[PDB]
Design a protein around this nucleic acid. Structure first.
Length: 102
RNA sequence: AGGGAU
């Protein structure tokens, strides 16, 4: 937009939730109205040398319509655990996909 | 390590 508030600048979103670990098939199942830019070729995650995920991840998408639809469930659940989503701009995604740590 | 405010 250019006449209202914002929270990002790209067709990318952040992800958080699920057990200490997950897979690209669970995250794409949760954004069941969107596209992951290429699927298992647009997923991302964050972790440390200690041997576990940091608790967060990202999901690239195909268009502005997918990022909007991903935010429509920003705190929903799969049915036995809950999930989180937030808007992004991909610069932050790159900033931690290559600099994550304890 | 844990449900944070993303």
């Amino acid at each position: 937009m250019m006449l209202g508030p914002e929270g990002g600048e790209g067709f990318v979103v952040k992800l958080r939730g699920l057990p200490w670990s997950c897979s690209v098939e669970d995250v794409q199942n949760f954004l069941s109205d969107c596209t992951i830019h290429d699927g298992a070729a647009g997923v991302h995650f964050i972790y440390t040398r200690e041997g576990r995920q940091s608790g967060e991840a990202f999901v690239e998408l195909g268009s502005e319509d997918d990022v909007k639809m991903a935010l429509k469930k920003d705190r929903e659940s799969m049915g036995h655990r809950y999930i989180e989503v937030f808007k992004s701009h991909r610069t932050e995604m790159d900033w931690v996909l290559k600099h994550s740590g304890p």
